[PDB]
Amino acid sequence: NDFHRDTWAEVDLDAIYDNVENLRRLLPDDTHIMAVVKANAYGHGDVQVARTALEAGASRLAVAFLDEALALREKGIEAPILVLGASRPADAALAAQQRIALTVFRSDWLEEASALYSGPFPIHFHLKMDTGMGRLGVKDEEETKRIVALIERHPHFVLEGLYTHFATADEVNTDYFSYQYTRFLHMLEWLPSRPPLVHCANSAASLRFPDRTFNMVRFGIAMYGLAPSPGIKPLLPYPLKEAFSLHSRLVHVKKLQPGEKVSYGATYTAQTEEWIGTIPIGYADGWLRRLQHFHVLVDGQKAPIVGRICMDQCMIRLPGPLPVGTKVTLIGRQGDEVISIDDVARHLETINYEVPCTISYRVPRIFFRHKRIMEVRNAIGR
Amino acid sequence: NDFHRDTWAEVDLDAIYDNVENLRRLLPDDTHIMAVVKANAYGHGDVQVARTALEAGASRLAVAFLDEALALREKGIEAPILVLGASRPADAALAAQQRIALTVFRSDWLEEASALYSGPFPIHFHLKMDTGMGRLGVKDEEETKRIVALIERHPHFVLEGLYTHFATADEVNTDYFSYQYTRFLHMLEWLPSRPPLVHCANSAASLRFPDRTFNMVRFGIAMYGLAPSPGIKPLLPYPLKEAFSLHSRLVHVKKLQPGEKVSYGATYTAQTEEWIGTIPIGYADGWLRRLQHFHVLVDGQKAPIVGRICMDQCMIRLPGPLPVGTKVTLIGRQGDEVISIDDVARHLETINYEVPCTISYRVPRIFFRHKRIMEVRNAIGR
Numbered sequence A, B: 001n002d003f004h005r006d007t008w009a010e011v012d013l014d015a016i017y018d019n020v021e022n023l024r025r026l027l028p029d030d031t032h033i034m035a036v037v038k039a040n041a042y043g044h045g046d047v048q049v050a051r052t053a054l055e056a057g058a059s060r061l062a063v064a065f066l067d068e069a070l071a072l073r074e075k076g077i078e079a080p081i082l083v084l085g086a087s088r089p090a091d092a093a094l095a096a097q098q099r100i101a102l103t104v105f106r107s108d109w110l111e112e113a114s115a116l117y118s119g120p121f122p123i124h125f126h127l128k129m130d131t132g133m134g135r136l137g138v139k140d141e142e143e144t145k146r147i148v149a150l151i152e153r154h155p156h157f158v159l160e161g162l163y164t165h166f167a168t169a170d171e172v173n174t175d176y177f178s179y180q181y182t183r184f185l186h187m188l189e190w191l192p193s194r195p196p197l198v199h200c201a202n203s204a205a206s207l208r209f210p211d212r213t214f215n216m217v218r219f220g221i222a223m224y225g226l227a228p229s230p231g232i233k234p235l236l237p238y239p240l241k242e243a244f245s246l247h248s249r250l251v252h253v254k255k256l257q258p259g260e261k262v263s264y265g266a267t268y269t270a271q272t273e274e275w276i277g278t279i280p281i282g283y284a285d286g287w288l289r290r291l292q293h294f295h296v297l298v299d300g301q302k303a304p305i306v307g308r309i310c311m312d313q314c315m316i317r318l319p320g321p322l323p324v325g326t327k328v329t330l331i332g333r334q335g336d337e338v339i340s341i342d343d344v345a346r347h348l349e350t351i352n353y354e355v356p357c358t359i360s361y362r363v364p365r366i367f368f369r370h371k372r373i374m375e376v377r378n379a380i381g382r
């Protein structure tokens, strides 16, 4: 893949490999690692991360919905994939045909799938139990037993596993977390027999209580080198390696006289003679307008974004006259300076999770592995 | 194209067609309309909108950078295309080969392209002049005259047009706008001869002062049925037809008991027995966490999002028990209720421009024309 705009993200797959391999060491040899690669691998590239994770010790993959699993299959992934979200009963055969496990939490969903699917491929289901997140999952025993029976009844339906998800595993206080964990052990008692795969832990839960993970953990945010929360940062077993960086280059440089305005609404006025540089990145690239008072790195120093951010471009105040083509780092490091995803998240008043997911399809991803450029991924490429 | 999650955006091409035809009527017959379809047509589907705009009266198209023009070419667009932003001198030949016009604002860029391009295809350039926006464009006569000469010297370099862009055309007070407009007429004098294409007006400027547009206008935001700003809303010559709407469906429905918590951080607590619905859309789809206290439309009534929004899902309080599969509208209308992009923009504290662009590649676009589904566009499809 090739691209024609000097703006690109870089994904360090060696970082991703180390983050996963280190967990593989920390976990019991009997414990599976399921790599969560939904939302294009949290904006890092679905197939590239999936392969590296499998390479580092992950044995299974997880996506948000069916479309995300089929895409991985088409790209050549043959590892098992679990759809964590909802799916249509009418798509059961497709999922069964492609060897994709489905999450189930409603007995009426199964009644539908049953009437539509007869075989010959078996469907692996994972029972979701709501223990306090309030998102998806069964809540009562009656509904739970009903589901187990329907699966039991059908020759091609198999209950491969069951799980829950924690709402506060990244909180230093573990009161709610303990309630959910206890609720889980109680509900597992509703099952006639324990499925071969029992899971509940996410990045935070598996890194904090690796002994309470059962047979499989679902590794997400931490695989990308980002802490589930600033609060638990000082409690993580090993150092995480940030894998995502974002860069651009100056395409224009000019000197403004005092009084000259910049950008929409003319909300910025040069106080004195200053050098303004224009970079080819805007909010359609995920660099939201709310980043208007943030700073970028240029020539090793912090340069403030001046004026409002445009759809495809934005201006910054430079230290002096720098040459067009000069590299600008928006996320990453230059010399001694560095800007992490956590820094961007803080200014945007959101969590790190949301930042890389928002860097759009317009921004090509360049992959590094073994300290070398592996491949380029340009969504709007040829 | 097909999709397997019950979440999709709908683009009404009839609206797009009407918004453009109405301008074609308002402008002098000698004035060209160049449809701005960068950022995948402001998130509406680049080729689908481009074809409709050309059908309605547009004669040319504009994109942000080269990659966007190439894609339109691959997808079968033959109409003239202008790249509004920066491009590499080394890509001049590729542009010339594909009949793509380029914006130029530096003489040193031309020096480079000259040395690298010899023909036989001619390159059509549009000279960008900075009149107060502070983004791109020449600022002085010396640099201007220099660019004209270089273009003149090369046999395959053609100066097809020259333009500027306004920073405050959507402001009721036209003080800065007049200065810019006046600056433009002054700088145009620097040109030995007027290029066949002089342009400066965007949506706001062309709708307010269609008599000051010259030979071509660059129609963007208004083409999608969105007002350049709320301030000029009452000054628009004709009613704009919103083309974008966003929907999903309930994938889970349950009753919470007083005291039960919902979502991350367990920030939401059921006060009484209530019905919570779960929908398959989250922040990786562009439904940013900041919309946490907003509402959606369900069964014709407003339903408040409860708890934090997740990457792929969120919860809403329901009037009562509704059947799973019930349609939810996030942007659009249901019965008497409606949610416009302007409403979402207000809650997110940004402008309408930014909202459709942020609805990600994960959300399929369903196109309507003549009141019938035209096609489906799933970015992560097969």
Ligand SMILES: Cc1ncc(COP(=O)(O)O)c(CN[C@H](C)C(=O)O)c1O
Binding pocket: A309, A310, A311, A312, B036, B084, B165, B201, B202, B203, B204, B218, B219, B220, B221, B222, B228, B353
């Ligand atoms: C050079 C140029 N011409 C024409 C337009 C169309 O403007 P409008 O959508 O308001 O009609 C734009 C706006 N672009 C995006 C919005 C920007 O700079 O943020 C532009 O940059």
Ligand SMILES: Cc1ncc(COP(=O)(O)O)c(CN[C@H](C)C(=O)O)c1O
Binding pocket: A036, A084, A165, A201, A202, A203, A204, A218, A219, A220, A221, A222, A228, A353, B282, B309, B310, B311, B312
């Ligand atoms: C069911 C499920 N399992 C596992 C994970 C991985 O969590 P983490 O990234 O914290 O390790 C998630 C989180 N998803 C996204 C983040 C959400 O719900 O917003 C999940 O939904």
